[PDB]
Amino acid sequence: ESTLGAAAAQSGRYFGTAIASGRLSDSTYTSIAGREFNMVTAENEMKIDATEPQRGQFNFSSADRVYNWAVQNGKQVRGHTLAWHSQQPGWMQSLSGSALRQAMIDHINGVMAHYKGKIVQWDVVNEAFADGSSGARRDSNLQRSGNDWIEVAFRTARAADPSAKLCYNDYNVENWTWAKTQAMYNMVRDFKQRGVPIDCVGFQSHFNSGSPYNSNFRTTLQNFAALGVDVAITELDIQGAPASTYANVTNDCLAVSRCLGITVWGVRDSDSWRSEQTPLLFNNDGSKKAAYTAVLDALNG
Ligand SMILES: O=C1NCC[C@@H](O[C@@H]2OC[C@@H](O)[C@H](O)[C@H]2O)[C@@H]1O
Ligand SMILES: O=C1NCC[C@@H](O[C@@H]2OC[C@@H](O)[C@H](O)[C@H]2O)[C@@H]1O
Ligand code: NA
Ligand code: NA
Ligand code: NA
Ligand code: NA
């Protein structure tokens, strides 16, 4: 096939991107994204601040612009993200303890009701582990509400939309030897043992010199899959966009039956949150980079 999404689809997978609503008037952006991807994540518009800017007052305007663009252009949508320490609205940042717990639950219920049956995967919880050697949970208001915050978020989500695949998403969790990876593995294993609903694990895959790709990503994906979850590459970008690494990541997904697909975290390098690292598949002018060809070729076998 001649496009990433179509090539991925031949093996039953998707190839997705992050979409920014403010760029949907950019003809280069929309045409390349429309052509190349069959899955969309809202880059920012489905986060907690954007969707619930004041407590109890939902605003789906920008989120729905992304969702509607996706469906109009033949893409599925991954929902990102329901419970996260980052990009909380101020009113949520000020909450703690049981009041925060209630607000977390309320937020999940309200957002998922709006999208019930329409979103294939939700990143229910994002970025709960700390970086480094400890494997500890990240310090946040959510974590300070209790270790059970994650499980409660998942149970809430399962009740709100039984059709959605419920994903835990994180970064620095791709290298099988890292403590953070093992902390996430232990948690998912615990959840499955105890019957906490979790259907999928998302590997953000922000690869760079400090957090480099390792061939053992395949091992990580296999080992999580063996716990009885699907796996997905959710926010892929690679410092310098080397073709070799991009092919390696693609082939790791293709080698794992429960790897649903790959999303890259933007379209052109200039669209990236980390543009200075030129980490995506298209040039600033929309042309294909060497890494594009490497990914397409890998998807095509
Ligand atoms: O052990 C580590 N040493 C250096 C890199 C660091 O990972 C970084 O964590 C912050 C993220 O924003 C970066 O993308 C990531 O590389 C890692 O924990
Ligand atoms: O899950 C995530 N982790 C890191 C990238 C983040 O997306 C970025 O969030 C900050 C915004 O300023 C950027 O536009 C966005 O790319 C993602 O949600
Ligand atoms: Na094709
Ligand atoms: Na086409
Ligand atoms: Na190619
Ligand atoms: Na080939």
Collect all residues with Cβ–Cβ distance below 8 Å to 234 and sequence separation of at least 6.
Answer: 41, 78, 80, 123, 167, 169, 202, 203, 204, 205, 263
Kindly state if the Cβ of 131 falls inside 6 Å of ligand 1: yes
State this model's resolution in angstroms: 1.0
Residue-range definition of the domain harbouring residue 262: 1-301
Q: Determination method here?
A: X-ray
Which DSSP category does 287 fall into?
P
Q: Which residue has the tokens 């639950």?
A: 105
Beta strands in 107-252 (DSSP E): 121-126, 165-170, 200-203, 206-207, 230-238
Please count the structural domains in the chain: 1
Please tell me the distance from the alpha carbon of residue 217 to that of residue 201, in angstroms, as a whole number. Answer: 13
Kindly state if the Cβ of 210 falls inside 6 Å of ligand 1: yes
Q: How far is the CA of 35 from the centre of ligand 4 (A)?
A: 5
Kindly state if the Cβ of 12 falls inside 6 Å of ligand 1: no
Residue 133 CA: which ligand 1 atom is closest? 1
Question: In this structure, what CATH number is given to the domain that contains residue 28?
Answer: 3.20.20.80
Could you tell me the CA-to-CA distances from 270 to 57, 276, 286 in Å, in that order?
A: 33, 8, 10
Residue 211 CA: which ligand 1 atom is closest? 16
Bridge partner list, 283: none
Assess contact for 82 and 157: CB atoms under 8 A: yes
Kindly state if the Cβ of 208 falls inside 6 Å of ligand 1: yes
Query: Quick check: helix, strand or coil at residue 217?
Result: helix
Kindly state if the Cβ of 211 falls inside 6 Å of ligand 1: yes
Name the residue of 129, 134, 170, 172 whose CB sits within 8 Å of the most ligand 1 atoms, as the mutation to test its pocket.
172
Tell me the angle at which helices 217-225 and 179-194 cross, rounded to the nearest 10 degrees. Answer: 10
The residues that are catalytic are 127, 235
Give the closest ligand to the alpha carbon of residue 293. 5
The enclosing H or E element of 41 equals: strand 39-42
For residue 28, whether the previous peptide bond is cis, meaning omega lies within 30 degrees of 0, is: no
Please tell me the distance from the alpha carbon of residue 57 to that of residue 64, in angstroms, as a whole number. Answer: 15
Q: How far is the CA of 301 from the centre of ligand 2 (A)?
A: 31
Bridge partner list, 207: 238
Q: How far does CA 202 lie from the centroid of its chain?
A: 6
